[PDB]
Scaffold this active site. Structure first.
Site, PDB file in Angstrom:
ATOM      1  N   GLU A 225       0.769  -1.239   0.000  1.00  0.00           N
ATOM      2  CA  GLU A 225       0.000   0.000   0.000  1.00  0.00           C
ATOM      3  C   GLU A 225       0.803   1.292   0.000  1.00  0.00           C
ATOM      4  O   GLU A 225       0.409   2.266  -0.644  1.00  0.00           O
ATOM      5  CB  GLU A 225      -0.944   0.027   1.205  1.00  0.00           C
ATOM      6  CG  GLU A 225      -1.984  -1.080   1.230  1.00  0.00           C
ATOM      7  CD  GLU A 225      -2.987  -0.976   0.103  1.00  0.00           C
ATOM      8  OE1 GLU A 225      -3.088   0.105  -0.512  1.00  0.00           O
ATOM      9  OE2 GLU A 225      -3.689  -1.975  -0.161  1.00  0.00           O
TER      10      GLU A 225
ATOM     11  N   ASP B 297      -9.162   7.476  -4.604  1.00  0.00           N
ATOM     12  CA  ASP B 297      -9.357   6.193  -5.260  1.00  0.00           C
ATOM     13  C   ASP B 297     -10.829   5.838  -5.379  1.00  0.00           C
ATOM     14  O   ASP B 297     -11.481   5.491  -4.393  1.00  0.00           O
ATOM     15  CB  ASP B 297      -8.629   5.077  -4.511  1.00  0.00           C
ATOM     16  CG  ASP B 297      -8.808   3.722  -5.178  1.00  0.00           C
ATOM     17  OD1 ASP B 297      -8.306   3.541  -6.308  1.00  0.00           O
ATOM     18  OD2 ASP B 297      -9.460   2.840  -4.579  1.00  0.00           O
TER      19      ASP B 297
ATOM     20  N   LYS C 253      -9.552   3.744   3.793  1.00  0.00           N
ATOM     21  CA  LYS C 253     -10.574   4.735   3.493  1.00  0.00           C
ATOM     22  C   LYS C 253     -11.422   4.945   4.748  1.00  0.00           C
ATOM     23  O   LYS C 253     -11.428   4.103   5.653  1.00  0.00           O
ATOM     24  CB  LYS C 253     -11.443   4.248   2.336  1.00  0.00           C
ATOM     25  CG  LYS C 253     -10.668   4.048   1.046  1.00  0.00           C
ATOM     26  CD  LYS C 253     -11.562   3.495  -0.054  1.00  0.00           C
ATOM     27  CE  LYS C 253     -10.847   3.509  -1.397  1.00  0.00           C
ATOM     28  NZ  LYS C 253     -10.483   4.899  -1.797  1.00  0.00           N
TER      29      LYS C 253
ATOM     30  N   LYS D  38     -14.151 -11.167  -4.912  1.00  0.00           N
ATOM     31  CA  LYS D  38     -14.162 -10.327  -6.108  1.00  0.00           C
ATOM     32  C   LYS D  38     -12.969 -10.627  -7.007  1.00  0.00           C
ATOM     33  O   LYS D  38     -11.831 -10.672  -6.540  1.00  0.00           O
ATOM     34  CB  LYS D  38     -14.115  -8.846  -5.731  1.00  0.00           C
ATOM     35  CG  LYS D  38     -15.290  -8.337  -4.916  1.00  0.00           C
ATOM     36  CD  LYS D  38     -15.145  -6.835  -4.695  1.00  0.00           C
ATOM     37  CE  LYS D  38     -16.261  -6.274  -3.837  1.00  0.00           C
ATOM     38  NZ  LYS D  38     -16.090  -4.813  -3.623  1.00  0.00           N
TER      39      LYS D  38
END
Ligand SMILES: CC(=O)NC1=C[C@H](O[C@@H]2O[C@H](CO)[C@@H](O[C@@H]3O[C@H](CO)[C@@H](O[C@@H]4O[C@H](CO)[C@@H](O)[C@H](O)[C@H]4NC(C)=O)[C@H](O)[C@H]3NC(C)=O)[C@H](O)[C@H]2NC(C)=O)[C@@H](CO)OC1=O
Length: 122
Positions: free
Chosen positions: A18, A29, A41, A102
């Site tokens: 990161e 983002d 976030k 995902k």
């Protein structure tokens, strides 16, 4: 880093992925700012229990940020059916509550493993 279900080697790898594990500040983002060592976030920070004195203050702390990751995985990992190892934790960190499911996070995991000492990290 903070203790928990995520290994220190895994946290180190994610931290390096990161921000090269540095207090780099924030960047935009997909609609929201990601900040600090783990590029967390605000929503993620809220979901991990609002640790620290504030979102950005916590994000700028390797310890607070890592604790947030620990709490986020304790909250969602098993729930989403993720493998309880770095492969699952990294994808959850990058993709959210069901990030380990995902396809988008497949690339994050593969890129993360390219970091020295992170290949197949558990
Ligand atoms: C290229 C790239 O990926 N860059 C970066 C990715 C990554 O940030 C991650 O981004 C995702 C998607 O924007 C975040 O996922 C969201 O996570 C939310 C917090 O858990 C989640 O909102 C929650 O959802 C549940 C289920 O609906 C609700 O029950 C909760 O109430 C709700 N919480 C709140 C407070 O709103 C939301 O649904 C997710 N969105 C999606 C589309 O899945 C994820 O949290 C981000 N991760 C971090 C660490 O911040 C990072 C680092 O890889 O920044 C990037 O640059």
């Amino acid at each position: 880093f903070a203790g928990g279900t995520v290994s220190q080697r895994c946290l180190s790898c994610i931290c390096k992925m990161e921000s090269g594990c540095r207090n780099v500040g924030c960047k935009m983002d997909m609609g929201s700012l990601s900040c600090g060592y783990f590029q967390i976030k605000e929503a993620y920070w809220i979901d991990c229990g609002r640790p620290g004195s504030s979102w950005k203050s916590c994000a700028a702390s390797s310890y607070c940020a890592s604790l947030c990751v620990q709490n986020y995985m304790k909250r969602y990992a098993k729930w989403a059916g993720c493998p309880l190892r770095c492969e699952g934790f990294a994808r959850e960190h990058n993709g959210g509550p069901r990030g380990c499911k995902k396809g988008s996070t497949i690339g994050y995991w593969n890129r993360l493993q390219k970091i020295s000492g992170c290949h197949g990290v558990q």
